[model samples]
Target: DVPVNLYRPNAPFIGKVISNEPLVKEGGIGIVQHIKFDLTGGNLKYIEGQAIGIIPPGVDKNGKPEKLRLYSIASTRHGDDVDDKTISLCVRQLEYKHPESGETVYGVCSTYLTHIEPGSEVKITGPVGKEMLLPDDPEANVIMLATGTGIAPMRTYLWRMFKDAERAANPEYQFKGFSWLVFGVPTTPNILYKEELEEIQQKYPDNFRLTYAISREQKNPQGGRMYIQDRVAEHADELWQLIKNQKTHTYICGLRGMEEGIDAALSAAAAKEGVTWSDYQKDLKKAGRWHVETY
Candidate 1:
């Protein structure tokens, strides 16, 4: 069974920061980090695609207590160490210039989690969310589309399916099907888990394929900077074929605005054969084959 809300905000589980490393390489536009918190002395177990609530240790300008922020979990059920004693989070500090003050303002929880020091104690609550979980069928074909820090849950799914250690942990769930990830980012350096993602594709070429939509480096067929939607349009026909298969599952996560673009592309693709995209999509939803969790 999937665990949920075992720890509440009033009495949250205290977890220790084990590591907080910068994920964005030099030349990347913004700050992003891979953070892990030790779950020792607690029972805050979580499954892939779930998220936890983080209570930033401070108050608002009014001096009221800070509210919690929910971030997608970036590790599998067994955690990054595959030891079931830690949880990982991929966070990109939210930054924007204040109109009046003309100063940059960073996100409260995001900043706190990203800058947290190792061995420091933090308030953590809930292993929430269930809409983005991976399918149980080991032979199901998986399609993932994500942008920016949205790669969190995708990483969880990939690790469970391709990581050798995770594979050993799930003897009955050996994956033998195809998986494809169409990732969009501002720059190559912004591709979180770049090395690990590539390594998986290299080792399992037949089972996994990786594609990038780098808005700064690549152009679409219309000579515009490529985006995740453009990649979907480019391969819409092939994707449509897979979606027609009942064994295929598709997931989209990232900026909420990206969803419309994806729907438009697939709509065009389905229009070719007189199939209504929305109708087909409704079926996918009813079957639990299409999952979306965007912010």
Candidate 2:
């Protein structure tokens, strides 16, 4: 069974930070970190698509204790070390100008996490979420669409599917099917997990296909900034054909607006084939083949 809230916010597990590596490279737009927390001495265990809650240490603006923030796990069930004693998060520091005051503002939990030091104790709770779990069938095809740090669960799924350590650790699940990932980012340096993703594509060229929609660096068919939707539009026909197969599953996770763009592109694709995309998507959702977790 999927684990949920093994540790509540009121009484969280005290885990130590194993590492916090910066994901964004030089010339990158913003700060993104791959933070790993040591889960040793805890009963917490999670699946590939689970989430955990982090309680920042401090008070809110009104002096109330800070609340917990839920972050998708970026490591496989066996954890980054494949030892069942850790959990990881892909976090982007939230920096924005205050609308009312022209002053820069920072996100509470995100700032706390991005600047956290190694060996620091962190309050962690929950291993929630089940909507994005991987299919048990190793022969199933998975199509993933992600942008920004929304790549969290996609990273976990891929590690469990392609990572050498993870592959050997889970003999019961040997992935022999195809996986296509369409990752959107503003620039090259902003592509989180760049090396790892490319390594998988290089090693498994036949089973894995990687596509990128660099908004500031590429153009769409209409001469506009290339977004995930435009890539969806360009490949909608092929994706629709893949969707028709019973073993295919499509997952979309990232900024919520892309879902709208994806739907529109697929809608036109389906229309070209005399089918209704909305109705087909409804059936896919009912069958649990179309997974979405965006924010």
Candidate 3:
């Protein structure tokens, strides 16, 4: 399928923000938002795994127009309201201490999105990306590993897989196979979309498994922070068994550090069965069964 760039640098769609709501709890360490835009005047259609570019207002230090930043689409194809007139994004405001000055700093694009007000106009472009698309097989087994804002695409996948509204909208894509999500966040309150994620799990216990690794709230066997890879290690054997199935598709999205940890954990598991993890992983990629998108 071809990705559509409905709007480009020269001519962009000026969409109005329909909502900008906080995703994390009141006392959460960082700021994250669930922002939706009205796409009534645009023809920017997209699937679950795609992203859209947002051009924040104003000029940069070079006096040039601000650059566009792409963020994964967080809503289903039909969007949160099952209406074809909107799109959404899960954005975490990038905050850090300035290395030279020791002062607080924030990401330009992320800050603009998080603090945007309803009715504010914003430039938008593209329904880009195909790497993370869901399989056409209705019964395909999906395993998702996400950390922080990586939950963006996973949210779309789960909604399409289990949400009643989404299921009704996509009649031909009814899911019957299992879907397991291993999410990592700093704390229980930092679990983005916690209520919605749990609702799906509670409703579809047999078909959906929701696991979390809250680094600050939980501990691994070694009594350390429980990151996503730690949880993966705990269930490496079971995961390996699932991976051996041709129908299983594993997706990893999050921090770059997660890749090595996951590989290490699965390597030990694969070793038990006399399989080299890296070699087998290469095979999975060749078969389009292993997918990863991280920053």
Candidate 4:
């Protein structure tokens, strides 16, 4: 027999869902659910962009209680005091249909979360995810890319980046390195945090930049569906120039397939600049310029 260590000590704090309900009204299938529990005796600490895993006590496909799923925490630690800031999770419900019964099979975690009433204590763990972090170099340029609920961590990052002492020291830091964001969705309604992102652009007019692609609604020059990759493609020259000139970090978070598309687009763009895509990936990885988290 072998003894297994399931998790590390400083992993995201695990707690119970003391309460849950919708906190937001708009956005695509968006639900702002609240959870309450004592994580580290209500002294838990984490930065914006890290994830908190809610380890539900449940069984596997075989009807067990050992399987768990991970979801990124959407709220910043600023509210930890309010709800204990009990850690907020912004999730998109993924539902499927039952073939034989003609019924719908709800997502494991999403469904479990949406239905739980107050006093249901779920096993929680986390503070994982590096896509969102305060760079050691205060001068480092940060670029965030996300679609759908993937913006969870970015919201946290933005909160921390602006407030972190090292990052806030510069008097002329308003016009720091480029912070590019390329987000895409099926319609305007599906766009997450539309006003928040827009306000960030306006507030940080000099340091921030954004471009959006409403794929199913907007028309592309090639007559194909618009997408995040397409937007990145159209802005290849400027993106490449930014990458080539400075120590810029690119973060991509969303569905698994989007990463492939982004890779392809970047590969093609790199080739146009007379560099092999493989080399570019290798260099980016070595230089810590590219970081991706997808599910």
Candidate 5:
């Protein structure tokens, strides 16, 4: 019998940062100073949808990374080999105004990443996230829901699909399927990589689609701020049909509390379509079709 705690040994990858830069800095969205690293020795195998875990240093009381925080890679493995052995991360500069102290708190990882100069050594680990995985069925569709920097993984997946011209040409390309993105942000300037996202959707008009929910700009039908869930709710019949009949897989990523709202909206929509909410939920979980990555 195998030992209960036995498992495969971890494959470690140590790298040195060659470059880093901020893509957009507003409304707490920091596109990470891009980093290109040289991996000396590491077991890092990647799929288009997987994410890398960078072991960032620890932090101090001031929310300063006494060290680093692990980050999920936002770029595909193909990009790494062609450009450099580098992975991207969509970072948020999370800060808070202390109620009593009246002082602004800085996030350790965000500060560290933004401040690092070229040629700094950064260590990272495995390709970690699983929620972004594409379905194997050629006829399957995909629903990607995200708010803030949560779109990172989905962007990685889409980039990989489009970057390889050969793969993009396949009639039933490994990624042949319908793709939809529901992304929410606070304002126009706060949007991350809006241009790139627009370009991709334009270039792949046949298979790619996008819906934006700018909370501060528009109100939901109920007169509340627009959110990703609100957008999903507005397209309830379509969303339900995609999931129920088209066999689309749905992936949601964002803040912790957002899932509750999404769940509520989905449940209501199912009821409206004469489908039992409980049944939908059960079927989704059983098939590993509904995935959420919240933090």
Candidate 6:
């Protein structure tokens, strides 16, 4: 189904920053924020996995007005307050050192957003994207893999599946199936939404499983830094069994590099059973049982 685009590029909706708080701890590797924008006067609405466009201030190198950068929506349709009048995003401030210049560079849009204060008005557009939408079946099993800010859509999915307010709002979509999340981050402090994620895991132990791969703090069996694919390898056999189930849906959203590693791990596991992982993955895609959104 096509998503409703309440605001477009030509004439965008002006939204106020309601809250902007850092997601990472004091000693974390990078800066990530949980930003919420108020949509009180607008009719903008979005689903779990859609993305929105943010047009930062000022002009680009070509002297044209700044263009919009798309970000995944981090809140459910009902929103964090269950008010249906807000939108949220999980953003990481893009900071890196120039290789030749030896000077620091920051992302224009990301820098502007991370520094914005409450009540600041910003241009907003789109509720676009459909590839990451959730299944309608309440009993379908879900497997989510995410890294860094890629956890945005997965956060929304988890809320819809376990949040009390969300459950109260959507009477027809009571999720009763198993859900597992294998999240990767640089360190323990970089685990975005750590508290909330663990709270849901503790409360719904029977239905939800949460696993973290902290590269700086953990090691894989091969004595290398732990990564998402390492965790996948550890559970490949069990995951393979789960993937064979018709009601299971697996989602991958994160760095593109993680894909090759995941495929390699699963391939080894599938080989044990004389099943080709590549062929099986293709069948899953054809069946709409596998979803991937990465960059």
Misplaced by over 4 Å in model 5 are: 1-12, 25-36, 58-68, 80-84, 100-102, 164-174
Tens digits of per-residue lDDT for model 5, 1-295: 1111111114346667766756565664434455556554444555545555554577566875443354555676545444435566676766677675659877766766666677776666656655557665765787888887777767766675554552544345466677888999887666677887888789888777888998889899899999888888888677777788547888877766677777777778788868786687777867878877767
| Residue 140 lDDT, candidate 3, scale 0-100 | 90
lDDT of 1 by residue, 121-161 (tens): 99999999888889889999999999988899999999999
Q: Candidate 6's error at 168, in angstroms?
A: 0.9
Instruction: Pull out the clashing pairs in model 2.
Output: none
Which tens-of-lDDT digit does each residue in 1-295 have in candidate 2? 8888899998999999999999998998999999999999989888987889999999998999999998889999898999998999999898889567668889999999999999999999999888888998999999999999889999999999999999999999989999999999999999999899999999999888999999989999899999999999999999888888899998888867899889998999899989999999999999999999997
How do the residues 19-55 of candidate 6 rate in per-residue lDDT, one tens digit apiece?
Answer: 9999999889988999999988988888988889999
The global C-alpha lDDT for each of the candidates, from Candidate 1 onward, is 0.92, 0.92, 0.90, 0.64, 0.67, 0.91
What TM-score should be assigned to candidate 6? Answer: 0.97
Ranking by TM-score: 2, 1, 3, 6, 5, 4
Q: Model 6 residue 101 lDDT?
A: 62
lDDT of 3 by residue, 170-267 (tens): 98999999899999999888999999999999999999999999999999999999999999999999889888888999988875779898999999
Question: What does the lDDT read for residue 194 in candidate 6?
Answer: 96
Supply the global lDDT for candidate 5: 0.67
TM-score of candidate 1 relative to the true fold: 0.97
Give the distance in Å from residue 154's predicted Cα in candidate 2 to where it truly belongs.
0.4
Backbone-clash count (model 4): 8
List the candidates' TM-scores in order.
Answer: 0.97, 0.98, 0.97, 0.79, 0.83, 0.97
Which scores greater on lDDT, model 1 or model 4?
1
Off by over 4 Å in 4: 1-43, 77-84, 98-103, 116-120, 162-175
lDDT of candidate 2 vs native? 0.92
The residue pairs that clash in candidate 4, if any, are 12-126, 14-124, 58-65, 59-64, 59-65, 79-85, 80-84, 80-85
